[PDB]
Design a protein around this nucleic acid. Structure first.
Lengths: 240, 129, 33, 863, 64, 52, 74, 35
RNA sequence: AAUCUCUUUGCCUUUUGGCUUAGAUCAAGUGUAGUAUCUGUUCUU
RNA sequence: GUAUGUCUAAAGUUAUGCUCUUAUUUACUAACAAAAUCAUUGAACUAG
């Protein structure tokens, strides 16, 4: 069923998904953020952030100096609530609200100010729609790698299973007295190197003043010994 | 002490070379990809040589030839005939941006180097490195 | 800005034509053709 | 070539190929060198570099967004390094934007992707400048001083008191006209959607809200009034720029729910303002006439001024034309609120000003609009014209404004006066303002002009008489036809501008000489010149002509209503700006239609050509550069189809392919360029009117056939106006007789006149006339659509509901079929004979169904 | 210290290139503020009237 | 010590960071507003002084 | 994705110095400029107002840029 | 109550999720070649 | 004089690797199928 | 529907609470599918 006009009241669940989404996508991808919410648009998610959820916003009780400044700015800049708000470093709706309280909707109505209203609490039984919304949000918030990296993951797993199947068949043949070599990877180009056939690009240590013959013999003997073994047995002052 | 300030380039002035023969003018290369020739005595802009698509990193004027050599981040090395104010030779070969050029004092050869970590010596006439 | 002892110029116009040579070609033999 | 190919066969390909810095690699290579330099400087200043350069990338994104880049705890020298390199990149980016825009303007070669990039760059640069302007205003305060604001307020008070104006009340809860004003508002909002079959989520949301407003009018009216009374904080407005090649223009996208309220308010204010006569007769555009008729009326108005052309006593006439520069952007909201409370209920004024103080967004850029009118608001036209009235009163003064407007009890119609003595009582004979352009006609006696110029020269002496330098003159007319730069006339023109410019404070608008044209008519100057609504006009009195010669269409005869005799001629031309706008529209078609079907390309060409010809008509006849541009445009449109077929071969594309009507499988193009273009010696042409001594070919084809030209099917404006005066006087007489007989006029009692008149007689019986009677300010509303909609009708100047059908091109198709040699000859070019189809009559193309029509709705990739 | 042109950032106060004229009496410098600066020696100076920085080799730095 | 860069536009590893890591007074205005208040009062009173 | 990378170091010409080259003939390397050059050796009283009563090194704020924007954006 | 911190802990737990032996010289060579 | 474990300091040790027009746009869908998934009920435990 | 990638497997023998049954919800994927109002007409057609 389509949804042509989005909006309504902001539930707590939506505010929490929006905050998690902002922590991942930043503040310039409101369409990607809103994509995690079923009933809210990109512009409404941006408004909910800029006017209510952004932690930098000053919602504290107005000081007497701020009350005087508010009345003055309201007289100097008539009806220019966003300019006044910018001067007060407070949300525009908070300033209008305070100004009204300092001068002293209905069922089926559209709320024009919904993005600045307090969040409707999640009652303990989450509706299925919101439960599915949370599941989809957790799934999209988890992903971090693109198609190529993901295919490389599955390809490495398949390459390992092929490797084990190859060794299984080779071991069955060996146990039956049929010795067979393991398949070498096919060359992708004329100069494709087989790194075991030689010490590729060998850089022998620079000769020094000290003789190494007696330790070279020892290393050679140890290398021979190791390889034969593998062949036989395997492996409070803060103040303003 | 400071005596004169000249403005005209639309980007940082990256290189400068004096006329080694008559000392009457000096050429500057800039981030704006152009080269400008200035009168030394008065500082007035004589002419603008436009022949690179990126920052002109170095300029060298021959004391034996009526030639100007210029190198740029666009990987090119160019020889300008100062009798025509036109490019006459291009030296192709640097893998990346060319940072410096030096003209050999007694040979018809130029040295150039840059980000590709090698010095190329070019025969001026054939343009062969 | 720099003091009265410093000449500050703003050069936006080439004072000589593009074809005016920067290094005059020598012509040791006068021709009449 | 072959030696290299064979070398590759034996030796293989080289492994050391160095790619050059071509246009497609310039940005990538620039980035590599910039990053390497930044890294070198940072690493050498410090006692993981790839992580450090991420700050450079962020600083560039911050610069592009105009967001201040500041990293807490960042070492100061490294910050300075990043900042200077960011500025160097910025300088290169801006320089490239200027360079590419200059190329685009002059028609130089520039790739389509580069054009789109340039539009993006100019948009960000414009927003950066706008944000800087707003911040400077907040820092230095308002430019309008307190005493000049007090003066302006008292001027509007004196005017409104003199008119005994009744302020517009808040729309009553039981307002008598609510339903009609609402239908008109929703019609205007719905118009945008009237034929786009493909909608996105935002468009669907707006159209659903409109449909809801039609279904629930009472709840809609209640909501609208509640918002007008109490909503003072509004949602942000999106801004975008439309490409016009010569320039770009802003488009404001307002929230759909707010837009419904704004549209209702706009209709209400214009209706009530019209009922209360808020706007005097001189403010334009006006619902009473289309722009061409405005130009015609103005010309005839000048010609009918008493003794305007006499020069026996050394008299002179001055026509001053200038622009009220940056008028809308310099609007202070406190002054606006105070002035609005003078003409409307305070809740409406407060709503209007609050609606201007909104956030402006473009991608990642965002700022609060604190000063200047947002032209995209539906009621912005009303505010604009009201602030314009303020400026009009400053220019004219209370006394002359009263003479021009007439008493409130009995207002003058446009350009008329209650008496000849009132007309002559003051030098300002005529005044009109078309939005931001003011036109003033002054008449001076020898002593009045001498006294004025003497004072001007006293304040601004010209000892070497160089005042002719930089004196703006109409370049489109020959040297002997444009204004003659005679010392006395040049000085009087400058003195008139100097006098008028002093009357309006610079804080309200920038009246600049470079944006002004001052034409002097005198014993030494027989031609009076002006440009209005895109028309270049030159008035020459008959008494000043060497000989009176007959003229073709494009030279209006001005009749003196007193003697009913022709006393002056008005030569017409299309302004260079409008010529460039037409060429830009053709460029826009070619740039957009990269994958368009041949039929849709031809249809776009037709739309633009018809828009041009039906608007300018006879002014095109003498505009040779426009004929040249028409030839090139039509050729380029045909080349788009030819190139789509990978062939430009002339014999493959006879005229029948392009001009055969759509119902016969042709593209149905309408031609304007198969005409002969006037040619004459250009040297003489620049000095004097050479006539038409030679012709040069336009579009041509091998086939021996003359294609009809669209111009021959559109009645010129002069003939429409004369015939309108006739049919409407006949109608007025029949109306009085119809009531004398106590009859009703029958529908066919006006047969033959139905399709005549301006407005068409048929509009008297428009189906919705009972609602359209309330539609006020409809012309300015239609023109202001340019600021709120990305796609606008090229017919911005006419409304079929109010004007009727102003043209009928059905005869063109008939004559093009005849020109092509008839159906027989046309079909000989087609595959028709191979179809075995019985008759050409049954050739019904299924213009509404096909596979591609079934497919356009499906889930499909861009490819 | 050089002085950057009006409107420049502090980072633009940077010498990028230089060359003496053929006589060595004029120094030409190109800078990040996009300007070219010409420097010359003071002709009114003398060994006694403009001694310059004192010869005082810093022993702390072991570059001797 | 150069702080670690956290971009508000790009997140190549898809990390989640704290919201904190992602995220004009001129007397001429008052003078103008009060001048317009005085002009409003002037007119409001003058009209009455003229009609009576 | 890691395929999109900044440059850690530029490819050195020392690598190509060891390669065995081919004999391709390039158009730009054909003979040209084969000889070197060498140097020698009452109507005016009724209105409310009237007479009767830079270079900076920052492109984005220069008057030139501002007039460019005023000219091209309308 | 749901919280963004809770959501992201559940994402973390949702995402946080064979020992072959070499029996002779031939398998060692295969292994070393691959490595 | 030599172990072991704590705590602080130091080290950050799997500890965000370019560019452009935020690169661009989109997020209304029937049947059937495939994969994952949800509530409940018995059953497992 | 592509680009494109991968596979092709004897012999042509180299010496020694937590789940389950199952009826649904939701998301994603499908060049799979000629779907009954608005003298028989989307119809073999669309790809980086």
């Amino acid at each position: 069923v389509p949804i042509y006009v989005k909006g309504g009241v902001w539930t707590n669940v939506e505010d929490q998904i929006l905050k998690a989404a902002v922590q991942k996508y930043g503040t310039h991808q409101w369409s990607k953020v809103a994509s995690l919410l079923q009933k809210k648009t990109a512009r409404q998610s941006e408004l909910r952030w800029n006017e209510y959820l952004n932690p930098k916003l000053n919602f504290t009780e107005f000081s007497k100096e701020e009350d005087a400044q508010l009345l003055d700015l309201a007289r100097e800049l008539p009806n220019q609530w966003r300019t006044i708000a910018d001067m007060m470093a407070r949300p525009a709706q908070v300033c209008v609200e305070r100004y009204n309280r300092l001068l002293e909707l209905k069922a089926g109505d559209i709320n024009p100010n919904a993005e600045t209203q307090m969040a409707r609490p999640d009652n303990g039984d989450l509706e299925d729609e919101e439960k599915e919304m949370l599941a989809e949000a957790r799934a999209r918030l988890l992903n971090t790698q693109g198609k190529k990296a993901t295919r490389k993951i599955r390809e490495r797993m398949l390459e390992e299973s092929k490797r084990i199947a190859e060794l299984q068949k080779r071991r069955e043949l060996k146990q039956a007295g049929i010795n067979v070599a393991i398949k070498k990877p096919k060359k992708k180009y004329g100069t494709d190197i087989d790194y075991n056939e030689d010490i590729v690009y060998e850089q022998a240590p620079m000769p020094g003043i000290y003789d190494t013959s007696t330790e070279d013999r020892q290393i050679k003997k140890k290398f021979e010994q190791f390889e034969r073994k593998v062949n036989r047995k395997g492996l409070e002052y803060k103040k303003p | 002490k400071l005596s004169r300030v000249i403005n005209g380039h639309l980007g940082w002035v990256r290189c400068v070379a004096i006329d080694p023969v008559d000392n009457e003018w000096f050429i500057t290369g800039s981030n704006d990809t152009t080269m400008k020739v200035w009168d030394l005595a008065t500082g007035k802009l004589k002419t603008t040589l436009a022949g690179h698509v990126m920052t002109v990193r170095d300029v060298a004027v021959s004391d034996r030839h009526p030639y100007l050599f210029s190198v740029s981040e666009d990987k090119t090395v160019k020889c300008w005939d100062l009798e025509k104010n036109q490019i006459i030779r291009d030296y192709y070969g640097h893998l990346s941006g060319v940072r410096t050029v030096s003209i050999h004092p007694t040979l018809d050869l130029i040295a150039t180097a840059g980000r590709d970590s090698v010095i190329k010596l070019w025969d001026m006439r054939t343009r062969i490195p | 800005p720099y003091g009265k002892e410093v000449e500050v110029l703003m050069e936006t116009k080439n004072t000589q034509s593009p074809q005016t040579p920067l290094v005059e070609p020598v012509t040791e033999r006068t021709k009449l053709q | 070539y072959i030696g290299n190919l064979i070398t590759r066969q034996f030796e293989g390909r080289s492994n050391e190929i160095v790619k050059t810095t071509t246009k497609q690699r310039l940005d990538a290579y620039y980035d590599l060198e910039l990053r390497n330099s930044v890294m070198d400087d940072i690493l050498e200043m410090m006692p993981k570099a790839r992580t450090i350069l991420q700050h450079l990338s962020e600083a560039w994104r911050c610069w592009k967004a105009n967001i201040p880049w500041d990293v807490p705890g960042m070492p100061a020298p490294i910050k300075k390094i990043i900042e200077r390199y960011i500025k160097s990149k910025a300088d290169a980016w801006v320089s490239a934007a200027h360079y590419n825009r200059e190329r685009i303007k002059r028609g130089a070669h520039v790739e389509k992707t580069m054009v789109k990039k340039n539009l993006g760059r100019l948009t960000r640069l414009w927003i950066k400048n706008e944000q800087e302007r707003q911040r400077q205003i907040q820092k230095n305060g308002p430019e309008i001083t307190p005493e000049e604001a007090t003066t302006i307020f008292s001027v509007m008070v004196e005017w409104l008191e003199s008119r005994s104006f009744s302020p517009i009340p808040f729309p009553p809860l039981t307002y008598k006209n609510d339903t009609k004003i609402l239908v008109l508002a929703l019609e205007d909002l719905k118009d945008v959607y009237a034929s786009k079959v493909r909608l996105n989520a935002s468009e669907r949301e707006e159209l659903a809200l409109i449909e809801e407003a039609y279904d629930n009018p009472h709840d809609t009216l209640n909501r609208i009034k509640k918002y007008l009374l109490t909503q003072r904080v509004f949602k942000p407005v999106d801004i975008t720029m439309m490409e016009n090649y010569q320039n770009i223009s802003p488009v404001y996208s307002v929230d759909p729910l707010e837009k419904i309220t704004d549209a209702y308010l706009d209709q209400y204010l214009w209706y009530e303002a019209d009922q209360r006569k808020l706007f005097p007769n001189w403010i334009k555009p006006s619902d009473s006439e289309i722009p061409p008729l405005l130009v015609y009326k103005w010309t005839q108005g000048i010609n009918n001024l008493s003794e305007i052309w006499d020069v026996s006593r050394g008299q002179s006439a001055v026509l001053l034309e200038t622009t009220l520069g940056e008028m809308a952007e310099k609007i202070d909201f406190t002054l606006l609120n105070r002035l609005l409370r003078l003409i409307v209920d305070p809740n409406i004024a407060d709503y209007i000003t609050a609606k201007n103080n909104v956030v402006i967004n473009f991608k990642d850029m965002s700022h609060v609009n604190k000063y200047g009118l947002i032209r995209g608001l539906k009621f912005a036209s009303f505010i604009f014209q009201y602030y314009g009235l303020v400026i009009d009163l400053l220019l004219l003064g209370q006394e002359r404004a009263t003479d021009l407007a007439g008493p409130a009890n009995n207002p003058n119609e446009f350009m008329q006066f209650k008496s000849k003595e009132v007309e002559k009582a003051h030098p300002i004979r005529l005044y009109t303002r078309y939005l931001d352009r003011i036109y003033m006609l002054f008449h001076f006696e020898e002593d009045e002009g001498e006294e004025l110029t003497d004072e001007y020269l006293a304040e601004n002496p010209d000892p070497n008489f160089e005042n002719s330098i930089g004196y703006n003159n109409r370049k489109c007319w020959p040297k002997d036809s444009r204004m003659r730069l005679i010392r006395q006339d040049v000085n009087l023109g400058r003195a008139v501008f100097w006098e008028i410019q002093s009357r309006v404070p610079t804080s309200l608008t920038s009246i600049k000489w470079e944006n002004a044209f001052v034409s002097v008519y005198s014993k030494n100057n027989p031609n009076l010149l002006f440009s209005m609504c895109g028309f270049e006009v030159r008035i020459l009195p008959r008494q000043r002509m060497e000989e009176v010669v007959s003229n073709d269409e494009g030279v209006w005869d001005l009749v003196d209503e007193r003697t009913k005799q022709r006393t002056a001629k008005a030569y017409l031309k299309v302004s260079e700006e409008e010529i460039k706008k037409f060429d830009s529209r053709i460029r826009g078609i070619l740039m957009a239609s990269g994958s368009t079907t041949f039929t849709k390309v031809a249809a776009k060409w037709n739309t633009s050509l018809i828009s041009l010809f039906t608007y300018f008509r006879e002014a095109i006849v003498a505009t040779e550069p426009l004929l040249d541009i028409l030839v090139k445009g039509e050729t380029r449109i045909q080349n788009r189809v030819k190139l789509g077929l990978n062939s430009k071969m002339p014999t493959r594309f006879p005229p029948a392919v392009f001009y055969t009507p759509k119902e016969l499988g042709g593209l149905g193009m309408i031609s304007a360029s198969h005409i002969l273009i006037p040619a004459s010696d250009l040297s003489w042409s620049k000095q004097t009117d050479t006539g038409i001594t030679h012709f040069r070919a336009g579009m041509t084809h091998e086939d021996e056939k003359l294609i009809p030209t669209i111009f021959r099917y559109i009645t010129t404006w002069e003939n429409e106006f004369l015939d309108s005066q006739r049919v409407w006087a006949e109608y007025a007489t029949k109306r009085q007789e119809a009531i004398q007989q106590n009859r009703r006029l029958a529908f066919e009692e006006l047969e033959g006149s139905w399709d005549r008149g301006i407005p068409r007689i048929s509009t008297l019986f428009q189906r919705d006339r009972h609602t359209l009677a309330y539609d006020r300010g409809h012309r300015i509303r239609r023109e202001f659509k340019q600021y709120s909609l990305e796609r606008n009708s090229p017919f911005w100047w006419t409304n079929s509901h109010h004007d009727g059908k102003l043209w009928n091109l059905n005869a063109y198709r008939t004559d093009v079929i005849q020109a092509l040699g008839g159906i027989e000859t046309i079909l000989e070019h087609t595959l028709f004979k191979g179809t075995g189809f019985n008759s050409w009559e049954g050739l019904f193309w299924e213009k509404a169904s096909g596979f591609e029509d079934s497919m356009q709705f499906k889930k499909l990739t861009h490819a | 210290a050089t002085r950057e042109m009006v409107g420049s950032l502090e980072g633009e106060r940077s010498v990028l290139c230089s060359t003496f004229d053929k006589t060595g009496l004029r120094l030409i410098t190109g800078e990040a503020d996009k300007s070219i600066k010409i420097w010359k020696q003071d002709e009114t100076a003398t060994k006694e009237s403009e001694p310059g920085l004192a010869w005082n080799p810093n022993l702390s730095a072991k570059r001797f | 010590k150069i702080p670690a860069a956290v971009s508000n536009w790009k997140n190549p590893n898809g990390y989640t960071v704290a919201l904190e890591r992602r995220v004009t007074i001129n007397d001429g205005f008052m003078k103008l507003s009060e001048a317009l208040e005085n002009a409003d009062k002037k007119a409001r009173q003058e009209i009455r002084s003229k009609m009576e | 994705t890691t395929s999109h990378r900044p440059q850690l170091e530029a490819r050195s010409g020392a690598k190509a110095a060891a390669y065995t080259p081919t004999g391709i003939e390039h158009a730009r390397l054909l003979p040209g400029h084969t000889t070197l050059k060498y140097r020698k050796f009452s109507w005016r009283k009724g209105t409310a107002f009237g007479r009767h009563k830079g270079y900076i090194n920052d492109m984005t704020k220069s008057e030139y840029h501002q007039e460019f924007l005023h000219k091209h954006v309308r | 109550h749901v919280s963004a911190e809770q959501i992201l802990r559940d994402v973390y737990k949702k995402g946080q999720k064979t020992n072959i032996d070499i029996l002779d010289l031939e398998e060692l060579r295969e292994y070393q070649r691959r490595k």
